[PDB]
Design a protein around this ligand. Structure first.
Ligand code: SF4
Ligand code: SF4
Ligand code: SF4
Lengths: 306, 178, 67, 56, 155, 360, 144
């Protein structure tokens, strides 16, 4: 069987993402010196199912604005990628081995843009057209680092296959050899999935569930995908279930981390952001995706292809 | 005394001792940590929230809220139609048409507040030379209708026939004080 | 207080442990106690499809015992 | 209050200054309600002599 | 049984409805400020599932704080026919109820109710944040009582 | 992409207050001035009383003058907290907002205990002050004020060396000094460009004469040096408080004259004359002389002032309110020239649009 | 130890409210498990616990009871309750509750507080309480 396994991949992340939307409000309260939800249930745990059932009773917003065969796709497309964006992601053994999986992430991660464009082009609003377009060049100039920062790292790894990284992280984490990559990686995780200090879609009305469902979904992923690449947890194959249990807390730290950001800083004024990724990171970055290519050439040895 | 908020720009011969400390304040980010690690303190602090209907907050006995017509300790409605508790009411909120009481005495036939007027300013509780009108600690009297706030007088007695157990202790700590 | 978030975390925190430990055990139930036996390159396939052609079509078994 | 003599060092290390003494909110030793009733002062011109309205 | 259960459903339909509602808190005036003191720690909104700043077009409720001029009114009602149609309404302030001060003035509306319906009126010139926070709960049982399918069954 | 020409539509909250006072007497019109700078109440009342007190020719007593300064620079602390933080919200920072609005609600209670209610405190009347303040109030300001110089620098740890703040804020809305005066900002928005000026020291009126405080001038005109002015003006209340706290004189309130202040409520109730005045104060009122003034006071905004105009009738004759923001906003479309959207948000916060001033 | 002392202190919090029903009730009722010294227990069940150690807005909390004047006050809990002698104690206006210094009977006060009736019957309706201010005419039923 196999259906039984995706049954243990989707519902065990959709529950998770929902309790992020809660923990979001619970931390940031306590960041802001206040309890969050307490009366929806025991300790706010029952907020999301309530908020969920709220939106899915939303009275029929008049479907303006297009042949609605495109207002159907923008949410249904982006959420669809995210649930697929997890599949190769190898908790100790992946659901799906991919020899090029780390590269399968970017496309699926980057193809989601058409949700933000088509909702911007469908939405016959002279402002939101070029209001949901800043956010696209935003997401795109971000995408470069998301590859280079990912690429130059895998230079001193073997193939693109994510199963390798567990082996490469035997005695050591990739956090130390490239702490800069991780820095430029981390913002490149905030970068796409705007839920970050920079938002630029908060300064797509009726089916707000799906963006609200996919946005936070990619968070737990792209935090997780940072752990599995840099903050490598421990595999030690006779009790592989440990790895997942250590894979947990790093994903929660990296995700508790984001929430400390939004309750740390303000937005970023979309001209700096380019200036940040066309003067400061990318020129800094190429030297690193020139450094690691000389690295094994210099050092002694280059990793394999299994 | 005038104080320059921001006057520190002076060419201090920026050397590698210090000029890189700014580069230590940069690429190896520290000021952002400094702004982050602060916030992390508060989540380990005591949130000052309170479970409102079970934990209501602090007031003081001079709180300006809902009105009420007091009464003497021996029946006898304390309001006597002076007609300066509207002449001062800046909202122009009030109409207190009056008559004799059929006892030969002097009282009202009318008394009014539009509580959607009535800024809750406090001129009337103090202008009343008798403390016949007062302004008591109720602030949960929101209703679903603009009409149920137009308190006439029978509500505004039987309200004053309710909190008199309370007002006569706040005012007990507020006479000899205004 | 500071710890009433943990019912948000530890519930989430016993959510993603499942697809790591389960999918381990979902594979090991099928494949017979061993793992999925990944196939990255072609040579990992001949050995497999060879082993497929040794017994009942499942491929996680017969070893020595014959000769 | 219930600060377990560790998180104080986590707060202060994470923030700086010893701030259990200058904490955010208030507990005790403040405004012990129902202070006694005061006999106010009086203003001037309660003097009964050389007190007209012309000189005020 | 049918009618028994639908009653037990409507207690659940109107629960998710009320347990997390998304306002569109206007400013406009002094009255605005108390909501922020109600967004503050002490009388927090977010403890009820009430969100601080939500967009109008996905809102579930309106909260009118302040005076309401004859100029702002179209800009107001334009919003009210852009919410969905569970939209509930809350009129903070003596200036929105009936224009407490400036009832009699000319660039002013003599009550938000003159323009839009009202599910709850709330008094105070500066209604205390709590003094709203009971009212917002009074809204949160104005609809726990109301039954949509219980009567649709009889339709 | 970029802004060149912007135009506000300042009318969306007008009410006719200047008209609506003409049909109401002075005492009957006081709380309208709490509404204008709805964030900072007393300082409006602090001015309105003076415009009366000039005409009536009265200095109120010291103890009432004295407390009129105290709240007169707690209200200073409010609007800074309301436009330091809201200038951070609409720029994006939502946290210090909530850190303060418990610290701010401890600052309303010190109206609620003193005045009737929390916010629209009709506490400062023309004849000094209505009502003395209680016993369990002044031991409380010490604890509060002690813990409060931390809460700011607690924040200044976080923002005033923050990249996301500084380059979002610095070089922004460069105001030329001599051009401000052509526009008459006359509040923070000129001292933040180096025009050394403050009425509290350049035209002192109340007991500010003996306080030993300072004016935080801003050079390098930009909304970060306005910001640092707005911070340090919060701090240098506390030097003023500490000096406005430890030498309060015992004295009188609600000026000795019963024609310009209501009398003691226990004293209207036996002494006849105090009853009649109580019956005519609160119906007819002062009966000012005719005349005219242009008062002023630097609120957090700036030169808040009133051109009250009188007549022998008890009621006024076209009061007028000088909304200091009213000129700051006319300069909105000159200081945002060669700048894009996102900072225009910041421009609003660093012009302090507490609309009610702007609106009438 | 340190940590365990909290749990030697945080465990009676749960096992200090009688049984489990008495505890689990409070939880869904108010989500406030804090051991409190009792001073009140009014008519119709308002308890008014207390603990001076917590901060300034939680040192006094009231637990309403069910069965108000026909309303089933388990879920639907108000603040328009708390009749006019504890309201002044709960909002920290004073220190002394109304057991050692209760209010003074005046032989006309209500004997049972009615809460904020929102839209039910038993609510307010306005009048024109002015005795009609005119007297028109009456025809004589005697034709001509
Ligand atoms: S409320 Fe007071 S002032 Fe007004 S009519 Fe009654 S007794 Fe006179
Ligand atoms: S409190 Fe002020 S506005 Fe309200 S009725 Fe009394 S005098 Fe009028
Ligand atoms: S009701 Fe009072 S506080 Fe509210 S807007 Fe009007 S004047 Fe301001």
């Amino acid at each position: 069987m196999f259906f039984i396994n995706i049954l243990t991949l989707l519902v065990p992340i959709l529950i998770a993402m929902a309790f992020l939307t809660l923990v979001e409000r619970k931390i940031l309260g306590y960041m802001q010196l206040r309890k969050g939800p307490n009366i929806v249930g025991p300790y706010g745990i029952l907020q999301p199912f309530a908020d969920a059932m709220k939106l899915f009773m939303k009275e029929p917003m008049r479907p303006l604005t297009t042949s609605m065969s495109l207002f159907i796709i923008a949410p249904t497309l982006s959420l669809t990628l995210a649930l697929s964006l997890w599949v190769p992601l190898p908790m100790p053994h992946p659901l799906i081995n991919l020899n090029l999986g780390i590269l399968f992430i970017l496309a699926t991660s980057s193809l989601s843009v058409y949700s933000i464009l088509w909702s911007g082009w469908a939405s016959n609003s002279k402002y939101s057209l070029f209001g949901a377009l800043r956010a696209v060049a935003q997401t795109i100039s971000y995408e470069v680092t998301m590859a280079i920062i990912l690429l130059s790292v895998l230079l001193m790894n073997g193939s693109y296959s994510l199963q390798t990284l567990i082996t490469t992280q035997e005695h050591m984490w990739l956090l130390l050899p490239a702490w800069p990559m991780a820095m430029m990686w981390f913002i490149s995780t905030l970068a796409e999935t705007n839920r970050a200090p920079f938002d630029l879609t908060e300064g797509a009305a009726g089916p707000f569930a799906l963006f609200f469902m996919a946005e936070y979904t990619n968070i737990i992923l792209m935090n997780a995908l940072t752990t599995i690449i840099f903050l490598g947890p421990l595999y030690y194959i006779n009790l592989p279930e440990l790895y997942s249990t250590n894979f947990m807390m790093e994903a929660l730290l990296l995700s508790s981390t984001f929430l400390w950001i939004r309750a740390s800083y303000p937005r970023f004024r979309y001209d700096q952001l380019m200036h940040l990724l066309w003067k400061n990171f990318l020129p800094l970055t190429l030297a690193l995706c020139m450094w690691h290519i000389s690295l094994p050439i210099f050092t002694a040895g280059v990793p394999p292809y299994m | 005394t005038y104080k320059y908020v921001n006057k520190k720009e002076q060419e201090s011969e920026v050397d590698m001792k210090s000029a890189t400390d700014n580069a230590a304040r940069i690429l190896m980010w520290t000021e952002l940590i400094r702004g982050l690690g602060m916030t992390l303190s508060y989540l380990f602090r005591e949130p000052a929230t309170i479970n409102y209907p079970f934990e209501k907050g602090p007031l003081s006995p001079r709180f300006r809220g809902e009105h009420a017509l007091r009464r003497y300790p021996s029946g006898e409605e304390r309001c006597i139609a002076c007609k300066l508790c509207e002449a001062i009411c800046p909202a122009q909120a009030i109409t207190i048409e009056a008559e004799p009481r059929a006892d030969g005495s002097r009282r009202t036939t009318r008394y009014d507040i539009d509580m959607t007027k009535c800024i809750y300013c406090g001129f009337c509780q103090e202008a009343c030379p008798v403390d016949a009108i007062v302004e008591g600690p109720n602030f949960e009297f929101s209703t679903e209708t603009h009409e149920e706030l137009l308190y006439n007088k029978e509500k505004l007695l039987n309200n004053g026939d309710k909190w008199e157990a309370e007002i006569a202790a706040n005012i007990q700590a507020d006479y000899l004080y205004r | 207080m500071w710890f009433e978030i943990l019912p948000g975390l530890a519930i989430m925190g016993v959510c993603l442990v499942i697809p790591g430990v389960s999918t381990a055990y979902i594979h090991k139930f099928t494949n017979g106690g061993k793992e999925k036996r990944v196939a990255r390159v072609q040579y990992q396939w001949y050995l497999m499809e060879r082993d497929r052609r040794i017994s009942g079509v499942n491929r996680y078994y017969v070893s020595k015992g014959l000769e | 209050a219930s600060a377990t003599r560790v998180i104080q060092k986590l707060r202060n290390w994470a923030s700086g200054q010893d701030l259990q003494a200058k904490l955010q909110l208030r507990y005790q030793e403040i405004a012990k309600r129902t202070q006694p009733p005061p006999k106010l002062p009086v203003g001037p011109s309660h003097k009964l002599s050389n007190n007209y309205y012309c000189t005020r | 049984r049918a009618e028994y259960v639908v009653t037990k459903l409507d207690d659940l339909i109107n629960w998710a409805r009320r347990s997390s509602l998304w306002p569109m808190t206007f400013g406009l005036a002094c009255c605005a400020v108390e909501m922020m003191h109600m967004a503050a720690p002490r009388y927090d909104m977010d403890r009820f599932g009430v969100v601080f700043r939500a967009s109008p077009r996905q809102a579930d409720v309106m909260i009118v704080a302040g005076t309401l001029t004859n100029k702002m009114a179209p800009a107001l009602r334009k919003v009210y026919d852009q919410m969905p149609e569970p939209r509930y309404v809350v009129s903070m302030g003596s200036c929105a109820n009936g224009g407490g001060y400036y009832h009699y003035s000319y660039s002013v509306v003599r009550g938000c109710d003159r323009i839009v319906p009202v599910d709850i009126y709330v008094p105070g010139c500066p209604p205390t944040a709590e003094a709203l926070l009971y009212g917002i709960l009074q809204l949160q049982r104005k609809i726990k009582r109301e039954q949509k399918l219980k009567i649709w069954y009889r339709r | 992409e970029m802004v060149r020409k912007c135009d506000p539509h300042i009318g969306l909250l007008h009410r006719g207050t200047e008209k609506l006072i003409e049909y109401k007497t002075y005492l009957q019109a006081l709380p309208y001035f709490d509404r204008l700078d709805y964030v900072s109440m007393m300082c409006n009342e602090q001015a309105y009383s003076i415009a009366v007190e000039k005409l009536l020719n009265i200095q109120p007593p010291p103890r009432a003058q004295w407390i009129r300064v105290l709240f007169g620079e707690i209200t200073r602390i409010l609007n800074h907290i309301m436009a330091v933080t809201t200038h951070a919200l609409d720029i994006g920072a939502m946290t210090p907002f909530f850190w303060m609005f418990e610290e701010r609600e401890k600052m309303f209670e010190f109206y609620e205990r003193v005045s009737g209610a929390r916010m629209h405190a009709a506490y400062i009347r023309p004849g000094g002050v209505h009502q003395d303040l209680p016993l369990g109030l002044l031991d409380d300001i010490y604890e509060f004020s002690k813990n409060f110089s931390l809460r700011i620098d607690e924040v200044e740890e976080m923002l005033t060396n923050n990249r996301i703040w500084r380059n979002r804020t610095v070089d922004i809305g460069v105001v030329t000094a001599e051009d401000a005066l052509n526009y008459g900002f006359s509040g923070v928005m000129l001292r933040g460009s180096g025009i050394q000026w403050d009425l509290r020291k350049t035209q002192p009126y109340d007991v500010y004469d003996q306080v030993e405080f300072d004016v935080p001038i801003g050079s390098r005109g930009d909304c970060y040096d306005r910001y640092l002015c707005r911070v340090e003006e919060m701090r240098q209340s506390l030097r003023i408080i500490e000096q406005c706290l430890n030498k309060m004189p015992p004295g009188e309130i609600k000026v000795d004259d019963a024609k310009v202040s209501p009398p003691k409520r226990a004293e209207m109730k036996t002494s006849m004359e105090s009853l009649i005045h109580h019956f005519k104060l609160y119906t007819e009122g002062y009966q000012v002389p005719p005349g005219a003034t242009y008062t002023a006071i630097e609120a957090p905004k700036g030169e808040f002032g009133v051109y009250l105009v009188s007549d022998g009738s008890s009621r006024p004759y076209r009061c007028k309110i000088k909304a200091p923001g009213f000129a700051h906003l006319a300069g909105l479309d000159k200081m945002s020239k060669g700048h894009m959207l996102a900072d225009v948000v910041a421009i609003i916060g660093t012009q302090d649009i507490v609309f009610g001033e702007i609106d009438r | 130890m340190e940590l365990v002392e909290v749990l030697k202190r945080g465990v009676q919090q749960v096992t200090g409210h009688g049984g489990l029903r008495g505890l689990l009730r409070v939880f869904f009722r108010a989500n406030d498990i804090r051991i409190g010294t009792l001073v009140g227990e009014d008519k119709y069940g308002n308890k008014y616990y207390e603990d001076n150690k917590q901060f300034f807005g939680r040192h006094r909390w009231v637990i309403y009871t069910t069965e108000m004047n026909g309303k089933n006050t388990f879920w639907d809990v108000d603040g328009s309750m708390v009749p006019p002698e504890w309201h002044r104690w709960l909002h920290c206006m004073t220190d002394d509750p109304p057991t050692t210094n209760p209010p003074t009977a005046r032989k006309f006060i209500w004997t049972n507080h009615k809460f904020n009736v929102s839209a039910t019957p038993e609510q307010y309706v306005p009048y024109s309480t002015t005795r009609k201010k005119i007297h028109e005419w009456v025809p004589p039923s005697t034709p001509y």
